[PDB]
């Protein structure tokens, strides 16, 4: 359509990256841990990005006692294995057929919940991004679909505004009809890109709305709320979170306040270009109990060229 091409709209980010600027950047949800934990990373090659990690976490229930994890990546290929104590294997592979077209497969294998298999194919266009993923996909003798399949579509209505929906198909056993749900997603970006707003009308009447603002090159802040719902009368269990992140040439700081009353901060001192020390403390004023954990990021290499590059 010729007359439709005049708009010249920009491709919005993928659906998963909707809350990246807030959830994964200006919040501790991902970076937080507990108790001591040492992370040793070994670099072997850069142009072909290859790496070997280790982990020694003690006192953290979420983290494992030990975790070996080797990461490889190239221009169009990316892979990552993750051995875990108790021989819990986790793996992920990302292959880019085209510059803008990439297919990703994730597989976690263990003794509990054996072989959760996820495969998804991502497409990115000039103005829209669509990705479809299938959780624990399989087939049945009756021939109907089995497992969970999710398809998400996001189209930029205007250069500063992108709207999209997320389709969900789930079928636990196959005997009963597979429940399906739809969620609406919205992403607003300021003309100057100074601040970004994202809204997610998740299924089951749950709203996840967040805001992001770049105060300056060092300081960016954002907030996020939630309005989960229920029924025995309706039960609504939500929380509002305010978080700010300070980044500097030597350290990165993240702070966050929770409507539940808990307060948390996350500091990362780059004492050396390689070695980085992480501190992570949280308080729970409602119950008056504190979560705390320090860490390490020892960052050795294994090649003379890599060491020379590391030192400059």
């Amino acid at each position: 359509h010729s007359h439709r091409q005049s708009l010249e709209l920009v491709n919005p980010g993928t659906v998963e990256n909707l809350n990246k600027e807030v959830s994964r950047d200006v919040f501790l949800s991902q970076y937080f841990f507990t108790g001591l934990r040492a992370d040793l990373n070994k670099a072997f090659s850069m142009n072909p990005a290859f790496q070997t990690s280790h982990t020694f976490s003690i006192g953290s229930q979420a983290l494992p006692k030990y975790a070996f994890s080797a990461l490889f990546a190239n221009d169009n290929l990316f892979a990552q294995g993750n051995i875990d104590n108790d021989l819990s294997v986790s793996g992920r592979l990302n292959y880019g057929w085209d510059k803008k077209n990439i297919s990703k497969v994730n597989l976690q294998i263990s003794d509990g919940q054996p072989t959760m298999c996820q495969l998804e194919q991502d497409y990115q266009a000039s103005d829209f991004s669509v990705n479809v993923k299938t959780l624990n996909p399989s087939f049945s003798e009756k021939g109907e679909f089995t497992g969970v399949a999710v398809a998400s579509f996001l189209q930029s209505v205007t250069p500063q505004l992108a709207l999209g929906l997320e389709t969900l198909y789930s079928r636990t056993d196959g005997s009963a009809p597979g429940d399906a749900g739809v969620s609406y997603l919205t992403r607003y970006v300021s003309k100057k890109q100074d601040w970004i707003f994202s809204g997610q009308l998740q299924a089951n009447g749950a709203l996840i709305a967040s805001l992001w603002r770049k105060v300056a090159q060092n300081v960016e802040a954002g907030i996020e709320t939630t309005l989960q719902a229920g029924m025995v009368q309706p039960t609504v269990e939500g929380s509002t979170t305010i978080g700010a992140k300070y980044e500097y040439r030597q350290s990165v700081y993240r702070g966050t306040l929770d409507s539940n009353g808990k307060v948390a901060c996350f500091l990362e001192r780059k004492v050396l270009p390689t070695l980085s020390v992480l501190f992570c403390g949280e308080i729970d004023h409602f119950k008056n109990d504190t979560k705390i954990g320090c860490g390490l990021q020892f960052e050795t290499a294994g090649n003379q060229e890599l060491l020379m590059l590391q030192q400059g």
Binding site: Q250, S251, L257, L267
Partner: protein, 50 residues
Amino acid sequence: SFVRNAFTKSGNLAWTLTTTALLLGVPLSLSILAEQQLIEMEKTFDLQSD
């Protein structure tokens, strides 16, 4: 006494505020101090250069 209840509640609130302020300010204070110290460093090395 209701006055006593108000007093203890206010004291608890002040304690909570101070604890939160420390927890969220101290690490940021260390970060700012380190950054400004590094800025002074670079300034000193430059002054050495010229």
